[PDB]
Amino acid sequence: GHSNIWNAHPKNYGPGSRTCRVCGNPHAIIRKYGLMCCRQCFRSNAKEIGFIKYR
Amino acid sequence: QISKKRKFVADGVFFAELNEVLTRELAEDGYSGVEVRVTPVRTEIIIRATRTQNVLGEKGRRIRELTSVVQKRFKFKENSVELYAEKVNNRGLCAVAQAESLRYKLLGGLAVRRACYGVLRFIMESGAKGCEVIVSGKLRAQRAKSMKFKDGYMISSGQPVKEYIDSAVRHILMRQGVLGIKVKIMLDWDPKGKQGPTTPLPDLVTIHSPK
Amino acid sequence: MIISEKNRREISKYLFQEGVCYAKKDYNLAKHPLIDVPNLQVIKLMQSFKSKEYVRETFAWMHYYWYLTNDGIEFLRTYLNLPSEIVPATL
Amino acid sequence: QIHKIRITLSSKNVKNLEKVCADLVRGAKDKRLRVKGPVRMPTKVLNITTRKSPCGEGTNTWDRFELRVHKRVIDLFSSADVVKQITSITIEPGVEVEVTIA
Amino acid sequence: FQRGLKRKPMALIKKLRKAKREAPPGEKPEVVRTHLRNMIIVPEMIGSVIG
Amino acid sequence: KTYTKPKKIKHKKKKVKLAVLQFYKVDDSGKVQRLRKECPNAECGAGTFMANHFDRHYCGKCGLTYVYQ
RNA sequence: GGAAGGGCACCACCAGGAGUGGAGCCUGCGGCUUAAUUUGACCAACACGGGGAAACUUACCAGGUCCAGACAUAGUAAGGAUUGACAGACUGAGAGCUCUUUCUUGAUUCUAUGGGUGGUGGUGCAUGGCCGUUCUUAGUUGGUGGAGCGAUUUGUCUGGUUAAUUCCGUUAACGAACGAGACCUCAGCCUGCUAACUAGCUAUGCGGAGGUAUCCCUUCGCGGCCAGCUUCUUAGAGGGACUACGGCCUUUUAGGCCGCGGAAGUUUGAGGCAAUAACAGGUCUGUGAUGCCCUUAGAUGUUCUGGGCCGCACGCGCGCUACACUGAUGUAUUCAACGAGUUUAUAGCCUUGGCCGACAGGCCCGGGUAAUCUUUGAAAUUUCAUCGUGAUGGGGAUAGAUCAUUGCAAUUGUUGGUCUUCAACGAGGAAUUCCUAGUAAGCGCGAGUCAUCAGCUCGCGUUGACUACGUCCCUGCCCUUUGUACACACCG
Numbered sequence A: 001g002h003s004n005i006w007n008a009h010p011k012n013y014g015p016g017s018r019t020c021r022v023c024g025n026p027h028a029i030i031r032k033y034g035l036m037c038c039r040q041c042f043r044s045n046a047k048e049i050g051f052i053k054y055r
Numbered sequence B: 001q002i003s004k005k006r007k008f009v010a011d012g013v014f015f016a017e018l019n020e021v022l023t024r025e026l027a028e029d030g031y032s033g034v035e036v037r038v039t040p041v042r043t044e045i046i047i048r049a050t051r052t053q054n055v056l057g058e059k060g061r062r063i064r065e066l067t068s069v070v071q072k073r074f075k076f077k078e079n080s081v082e083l084y085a086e087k088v089n090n091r092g093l094c095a096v097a098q099a100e101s102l103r104y105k106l107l108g109g110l111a112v113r114r115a116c117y118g119v120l121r122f123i124m125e126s127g128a129k130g131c132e133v134i135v136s137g138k139l140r141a142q143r144a145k146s147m148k149f150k151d152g153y154m155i156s157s158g159q160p161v162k163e164y165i166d167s168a169v170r171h172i173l174m175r176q177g178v179l180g181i182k183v184k185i186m187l188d189w190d191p192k193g194k195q196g197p198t199t200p201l202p203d204l205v206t207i208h209s210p211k
Numbered sequence C: 001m002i003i004s005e006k007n008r009r010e011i012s013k014y015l016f017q018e019g020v021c022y023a024k025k026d027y028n029l030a031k032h033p034l035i036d037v038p039n040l041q042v043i044k045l046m047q048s049f050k051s052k053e054y055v056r057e058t059f060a061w062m063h064y065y066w067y068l069t070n071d072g073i074e075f076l077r078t079y080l081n082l083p084s085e086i087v088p089a090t091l
Numbered sequence D: 001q002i003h004k005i006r007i008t009l010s011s012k013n014v015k016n017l018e019k020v021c022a023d024l025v026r027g028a029k030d031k032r033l034r035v036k037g038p039v040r041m042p043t044k045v046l047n048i049t050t051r052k053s054p055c056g057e058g059t060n061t062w063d064r065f066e067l068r069v070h071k072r073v074i075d076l077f078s079s080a081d082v083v084k085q086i087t088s089i090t091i092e093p094g095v096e097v098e099v100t101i102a
Numbered sequence E: 001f002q003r004g005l006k007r008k009p010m011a012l013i014k015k016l017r018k019a020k021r022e023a024p025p026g027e028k029p030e031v032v033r034t035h036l037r038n039m040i041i042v043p044e045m046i047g048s049v050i051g
Numbered sequence F: 001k002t003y004t005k006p007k008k009i010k011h012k013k014k015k016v017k018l019a020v021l022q023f024y025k026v027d028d029s030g031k032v033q034r035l036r037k038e039c040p041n042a043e044c045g046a047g048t049f050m051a052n053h054f055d056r057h058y059c060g061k062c063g064l065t066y067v068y069q
Numbered sequence G: 001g002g003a004a005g006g007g008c009a010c011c012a013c014c015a016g017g018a019g020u021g022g023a024g025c026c027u028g029c030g031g032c033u034u035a036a037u038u039u040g041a042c043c044a045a046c047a048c049g050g051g052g053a054a055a056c057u058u059a060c061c062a063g064g065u066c067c068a069g070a071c072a073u074a075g076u077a078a079g080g081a082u083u084g085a086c087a088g089a090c091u092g093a094g095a096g097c098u099c100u101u102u103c104u105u106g107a108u109u110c111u112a113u114g115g116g117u118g119g120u121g122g123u124g125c126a127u128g129g130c131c132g133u134u135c136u137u138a139g140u141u142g143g144u145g146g147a148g149c150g151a152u153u154u155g156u157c158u159g160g161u162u163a164a165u166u167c168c169g170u171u172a173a174c175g176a177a178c179g180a181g182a183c184c185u186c187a188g189c190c191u192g193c194u195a196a197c198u199a200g201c202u203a204u205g206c207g208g209a210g211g212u213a214u215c216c217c218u219u220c221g222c223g224g225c226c227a228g229c230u231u232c233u234u235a236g237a238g239g240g241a242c243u244a245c246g247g248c249c250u251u252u253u254a255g256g257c258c259g260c261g262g263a264a265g266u267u268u269g270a271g272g273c274a275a276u277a278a279c280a281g282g283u284c285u286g287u288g289a290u291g292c293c294c295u296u297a298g299a300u301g302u303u304c305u306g307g308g309c310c311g312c313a314c315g316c317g318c319g320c321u322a323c324a325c326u327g328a329u330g331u332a333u334u335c336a337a338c339g340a341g342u343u344u345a346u347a348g349c350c351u352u353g354g355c356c357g358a359c360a361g362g363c364c365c366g367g368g369u370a371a372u373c374u375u376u377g378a379a380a381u382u383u384c385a386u387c388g389u390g391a392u393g394g395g396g397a398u399a400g401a402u403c404a405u406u407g408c409a410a411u412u413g414u415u416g417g418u419c420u421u422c423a424a425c426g427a428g429g430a431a432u433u434c435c436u437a438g439u440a441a442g443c444g445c446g447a448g449u450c451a452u453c454a455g456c457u458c459g460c461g462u463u464g465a466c467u468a469c470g471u472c473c474c475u476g477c478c479c480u481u482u483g484u485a486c487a488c489a490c491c492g
């Protein structure tokens, strides 16, 4: 589309400005500590990341 | 200049992303796992595979390409990150390698029962205390079913599972759908710790023979 | 896709000189981190190269990874008019 | 030519961190240097609690994920060259070593 | 107003001005249609016909 | 789905058999005369003409417009 | 099984506490309405999809753009396939979107046929993975022997005991493999070890204040890396409980009750982990997970504007605020824990201090990438006054005016202040939930979501109880015996 129109809406904040770094989904993003992973992807990769279940 | 919390979390995220990238790229070549070692002004990445000839390629062209792409994508300083390909000792004791082997066999048209039995026999002959292979999906019919193959010892509860059990999960893209393959291998106690945990099972008591 | 001649020349030059190239899956990124060309054109040119077997494509964690092949090397050498002696830095 | 060299060690594994601290302390002692520490800072416990289900169905069950970061502080009263030599000893992976002055 | 109006409200007021100017004497101005639901009505717009 | 208004047709550039041919005039002696102005912009350079519109002159490269009264 | 026996469970009861169900409001669901009010889910759906949606998210609706349709063949084509664009009109629109006017560009495209690609499109009754549930209970299965023509059976049991298929034993079984336990994390004790200027104590030196004012006593502030030390704080290694000891009961057993001592005598407390076999339970709307089907340029792709997801005769679920004096308001007073924090750009995150302001807020110096700075870090409560049984100074719904902050945008109030208005509600029917000790309940705090919004969830601490420590009556679970015309298994 026209440069001034195509993708012209600001995306400086809100759920639409962030996505999962693993799958790109914009929902249920864990922003704590800079993980920037969705809860499903984080639960899949927790052991590799270094998070352990003690209780 | 970031805080320790974010530094460690970023290290873990980098490890996970590198593992996923290597798994995707080195699927057919075989990829048991990767290890990242950090040293002053130098970071070492070691690739574990059952076929290092494919990983290296001719005159290391493939490994050089992987090093270059890793350095460019992860913003590493040039001539600061280098890759190494190492043989995996007792590949039959690696759940990832066995899962990949079973995936290759199934993709080749081999019968599920024969392939699973062969994998179990290979694992057991490699010194495993026990093993378990599960195949799930649409087998022989439009109705999904699970196939379970088991032999030897196996534990499933408590802390010792995290060390005495090596497990993996892989998906096989068949013509009529996805097949789920789970490989679970129980290691054996190793005083040296190279081939197994360097800790005995909690409920194992040994009495020295009297003089 | 319509790509300016200068942009295609820059992309091909970088690919041949380095032998590898990545790209985040961001169609609207103004400029590729390693190449001055917009990210979308880099991604689409690499897709065109892959479609005819000049490159191998790997995708993981919302990123592209492209590795040049022998046919791709020959095509880039012919198109860039470089001497046969010059080869990608990977080799 | 004497300075208070500050060494900060951070790791996720207690055993490796403690072994590295002991090795550094013994190396400093072997040179007749003055060693203060190692000082153990309070453990940092990064915690993430996420729902087990990838959807909204079933009893709401939660996974408590913790990442523990252990930090140690060692002070040496000596020159930069000797501390640099001491820190050159082999360090296992997972332990970060930072050397500064004051 | 302190934050500053963007181009669209200025264009809308200019269009309303133009419509008012071209209105025949003793007659209402033509219809000016816009999507600007967040525009604030100022005294200058009194008497305008807006869609 | 149902449509009310007629389908819109995307713009297609009109075809001129020789647009360049009408930008120059050649005399018998061989002198060449240009029937259209040249954009003063350095980026456009020499050889870039400006359209002869009925109220202004338009340059197709840099978009510079000159209005004459 | 409205059959018997034994045992067990605050998702059962008993004895009780708080309650919920009644009121206002918040929030989810149905219905209704609508252009749309997107949609999954019906103990084991309903503050659940981490689902607190102004834009985005978004899947819905009304409109306008764009290709981000690779690759192959054919056509057109440098006498130009095709791109972009000033001005005017058109348009919601500084979208050349389109039209008029005609300039620029150069094989990158356009046209057609195949083949792709994308899709929060259908199918969770085609699937993988994950999660929930059966099911918090103690249960489950080979080998070799024994029985049976066989399906099957014994092992895996009469009894005692245990939280436990936990043990003692009995024994056509003997040996084993899972589950249980062990295990691991946190908490509780250590005046014992190592070590602390990113934690403290003690004494000293100086200084301020008070007291007889020199000397002495009390209380505060500042330094000593050559003042000492680790009780207080931190975190590594270890020790510590094993029912160890005493009295009774029990088979000279396994074990149980009580008791001194002890930090601890319910498995010390709380968790994590957790078998076999299953559900057409949920998820294709987490995934570049995925089969098939649909669509694929006037698009179910993508983007832009606007609206909606919140719409209100009504019904339901989880909740917040109350109905008051064991209180409300106004003073004075002073005790936590788990945690979280920056791109430095003039500056982005947590923010101290100073100034301005009634508040909300604003400005200026600065600290902290952190046991270094915010953090010198709460409320209920304690204390003294006013109020005086009056829907009252209880209650704070609804509404008016007006002022700030976040954001590109606040209207259908984003949120937060000021004055004003002052609804139901006077303890809640049938029914119904959770809970046995630092627990219930009350009180606040941190994190997740987050530009701005918490009545929600996940954790944290403070004050701190009543009742019981029993049973199978209700609702259910385990084992055994027994009946069956059930096996889609009594919702038969």
Ligand SMILES: [K+]
Pocket (backbone or CB within 6 Å): G020
């Ligand atoms: K009530």
Ligand SMILES: [K+]
Pocket (backbone or CB within 6 Å): G048
């Ligand atoms: K719920």
Ligand SMILES: [K+]
Pocket (backbone or CB within 6 Å): none
């Ligand atoms: K499933």
Ligand SMILES: [K+]
Pocket (backbone or CB within 6 Å): none
């Ligand atoms: K048998």
Ligand SMILES: [K+]
Pocket (backbone or CB within 6 Å): G284
């Ligand atoms: K599908």
Ligand SMILES: [K+]
Pocket (backbone or CB within 6 Å): A025, A026, A027, A028, A038, A039, A040, G286
């Ligand atoms: K997601």
Ligand SMILES: [K+]
Pocket (backbone or CB within 6 Å): G472
């Ligand atoms: K009962």
Ligand SMILES: [K+]
Pocket (backbone or CB within 6 Å): G007, G478, G479
């Ligand atoms: K039982």
Ligand SMILES: [K+]
Pocket (backbone or CB within 6 Å): G483
């Ligand atoms: K009968």
Ligand SMILES: [K+]
Pocket (backbone or CB within 6 Å): none
């Ligand atoms: K029967």
Ligand SMILES: [Mg+2]
Pocket (backbone or CB within 6 Å): B155, B156, B157
């Ligand atoms: Mg076990």
Ligand SMILES: [Mg+2]
Pocket (backbone or CB within 6 Å): B157, B158
């Ligand atoms: Mg257990």
Ligand SMILES: [Mg+2]
Pocket (backbone or CB within 6 Å): none
């Ligand atoms: Mg009940």
Ligand SMILES: [Mg+2]
Pocket (backbone or CB within 6 Å): none
């Ligand atoms: Mg009762």
Ligand SMILES: [Mg+2]
Pocket (backbone or CB within 6 Å): none
């Ligand atoms: Mg109510």
Ligand SMILES: [Mg+2]
Pocket (backbone or CB within 6 Å): none
């Ligand atoms: Mg609705």
